[PDB]
Subunit: 139 residues, 3 copies
């Protein structure tokens, strides 16, 4: 049960707004709180492993993004949570262990990890939410 | 007189330099202090509102970017100001209220907000200057 | 012996990993620690000077990136160093002076500055390393 950081970082960002939504500057991922329905896709996270034929690929969430076996995006001020489910788009088997989401089998896996809203959270306060995931391997 | 944050953030950045100017890395917006003449354009800010047929679109500047009914870009160290005027490129009417720049009429407005140097400031200390504007609505 | 900041900033980033390397999200510069051999290229830094016909172009490294006439990328936590050599790809002559790398002759130089691993450092701890260089002129 140990994660070894070894890889790069993917940052999933979402700006939550009200129905009257004012987009300023370049396009970013934004949704009204009413769109935060159960299983709503937030976005994909690409994963490409190399040199892991004998290790279990893994992603570790920043400390501020997990608690009690649950993952969540966190607001800029660290106060507000948006609970999510993390799931590879393929049929591969993974396990969650204290902020770590690791593959059950060894191998240099490449694939897409989807981030989805876990439970309708249409009362989420408007703000900027982030989930940070770092590549590495588990054992 | 209340701003409700609801939208994304646009960041206007400018690096001020001397006449001998050394650009390192990728292109960014940079000017010599001698170019900071009155009404000099710093750059455009896009605004695209959705679902605001019954609200007044608004942009709020970060606390560090306004004081006394005046807006300004602020240096990285929070010390130096570059006073600017904020004005939509179209003929629409807006109002300034304590760091908030709001549209006089309701509607899902889309347009360009220009950022211009307010008063010649050719003695501005070289540094990195930023103005941050967040989308939302006023009332 | 004085650097005057006047120009923009170039940030050289490198993520060091183990042999089992898990890339998450968009492509960034990453190497296994085994690739950190002597003279290994980390990446180029573009420099384009304007209005410097009578000044010596210069780049100053952030305080956290130099000590004792040596430059280094520094880990996110400020603890770990990756010593590098900084060298223009052309035949021009430069001098190092306390975190400052300046050109020996005046002129509005444009060119590429290469960043190379200085001494094999294959035991470098996995992490994110950065070197920040700001444009200006020396005298
Ligand atoms: O954002 C996602 N999906 C969309 C549907 O809204 C779509 O299925 C999709 C799948 C893959 C993809 N990719 O691989 O880049 C992008 C979008 C899920 Cl992976 Cl969270
Ligand atoms: O940067 C601006 N303007 C330039 C002139 O220097 C030009 O008028 C312009 C107008 C619109 C624009 N846009 O819509 O992206 C970009 C440049 C002003 Cl909007 Cl501040
Ligand atoms: O990254 C570098 N070099 C590569 C070799 O790995 C190559 O020589 C190169 C040279 C110039 C260049 N550029 O000008 O953008 C990019 C790569 C050195 Cl400049 Cl550090």
């Amino acid at each position: 049960g140990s994660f070894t950081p070894s890889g790069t970082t993917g940052t999933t960002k979402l700006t939550v707004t009200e129905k009257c939504q004012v987009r300023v500057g370049d396009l970013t991922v934004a949704k009204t709180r009413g769109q935060l329905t159960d299983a709503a896709p937030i976005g994909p996270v690409t994963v490409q492993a190399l040199g892991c034929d004998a290790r279990q690929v893994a992603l570790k969430a920043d400390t501020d993004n997990f608690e009690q076996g649950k993952f969540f995006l966190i607001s800029d001020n660290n106060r507000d949570k948006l609970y999510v489910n993390i799931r590879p788009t393929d049929n591969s088997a993974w396990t969650t262990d204290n902020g770590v989401f690791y593959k059950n089998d060894v191998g240099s896996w490449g694939g897409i990890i989807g981030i989805y809203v876990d439970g309708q959270q249409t009362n989420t306060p408007p703000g900027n939410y982030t989930l940070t995931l770092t590549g590495g391997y588990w054992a």
